[PDB]
Amino acid sequence: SYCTLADLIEQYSEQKIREVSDRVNKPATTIDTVIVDRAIADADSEIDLHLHGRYQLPLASVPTALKRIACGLAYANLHIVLKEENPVYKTAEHLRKLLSGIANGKLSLALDADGKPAPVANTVQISEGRNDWGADW
Amino acid sequence: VDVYGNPIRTQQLREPQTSRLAGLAKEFAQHPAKGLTPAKLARILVEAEQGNLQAQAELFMDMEERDAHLFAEMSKRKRAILGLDWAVEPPRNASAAEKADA
């Protein structure tokens, strides 16, 4: 859960979320929490796909850039039909480009609140190392 | 008494000293030479200097057994002595009694 309904509202106003989240009542009247929850879940899933190779997936804390990316992806997912020229599609593609840059070791994952994230132990691995005759015998 | 002057009592000559320590006879060597590294050998030497001669003696036995060159050299050195003729000679300018004892 890199973002919540409150985050989506505070980013995109409440009226737009009310429009795009309600599929049964015309005009929309209430935000359906299930659709927003699933959109956030799908955004988190895509981010996990992009981030599993460099960090522990079950993150204990959420970086703020991660929050922005998750909110953008969830808003993009909330659209039943999305065109290539739709500006929200362009924003989603931009966020995907940032995610790819992070994955490819071109961008870093910033602070969560005050401490660094938990980089995985990929590069740590090396052989045991045989260096006898150098132990001050 | 012995040359060292310690009092000698003939009662104890009837039985070996180690006879009362049957546990020793049943011991088997632990072979510390297997998987030996410089740190382990240095530890063995240091602990031997402090009075733990068991590991050092076992290591020396393994070392003499496992090395053919050291084996041959030590055997040559010892067989050099084994081939020497020996005789018993009395004290300097000895008397008839000392000559007879010798």
Is A133 close to B41, i.e. CB distance below 8 A? Answer: no
State whether residue B39 sits within 8 Å of chain A by CB: yes
A53-60 contacts at long range (C-beta below 8 A, 24 or more positions apart): A53/A103, A53/A120, A53/A122, A54/A102, A54/A103, A54/A105, A54/A109, A54/A119, A54/A120, A54/A122, A55/A109, A55/A117, A55/A118, A55/A119, A55/A120, A56/A118, A56/A120, A59/A112, A59/A117, A59/A118, A60/A118
Contacts of B42 in chain A (CB under 8 A): 137
Q: Which residues contact A122 (CB under 8 A, 6 or more apart)?
A: A53, A54
| Rounded Cα–Cα distance for residues A88 and A70 (Å) | 13
Contacts of B37 in chain A (CB under 8 A): 132, 135
Give backbone dihedrals phi and psi of A86, rounded to 5 degrees, phi first. Answer: -65, 130
- Distance to chain B for A137, nearest Cα, Å: 5
With beta carbons less than 8 A apart as the criterion, state whether B71 and B64 touch: yes
Q: Which two tokens stand for residue B72?
A: 């041959």
Per-residue tokens: A44: 């988190």
Two tokens at A101? 């840059």
Shortest Cα–Cα distance, A135 to chain B (Å): 7
Kind and range of the H or E element at A1? Answer: none
Alpha-carbon gap, residue B34 to B38, rounded angstroms: 12
Chain A residues near residue B39 by CB distance under 8 angstroms: 132, 135, 137
Indicate which of A132, A136, A137 best probes the interface with B, i.e. most B CBs within 10 Å of its own CB.
A137
Give the span between the Cα atoms of A64 and A3, in whole angstroms. Answer: 10
Chain A closest-CA separation from residue B59 CA (Å): 17
Dihedral-angle region of residue A102 (phi above 0 means left; psi in -120 to 50 means alpha; beta otherwise) = alpha
- Which single residue is written with the structure tokens 């000392």? B98
Task: Chain B: give the shortest CA distance to residue A125, in Å.
Answer: 25
Exposure of A79 by Cβ count < 10 A (0-12 exposed, 13-18 middle, 19+ buried)? middle
| Residue type at position A47 | I
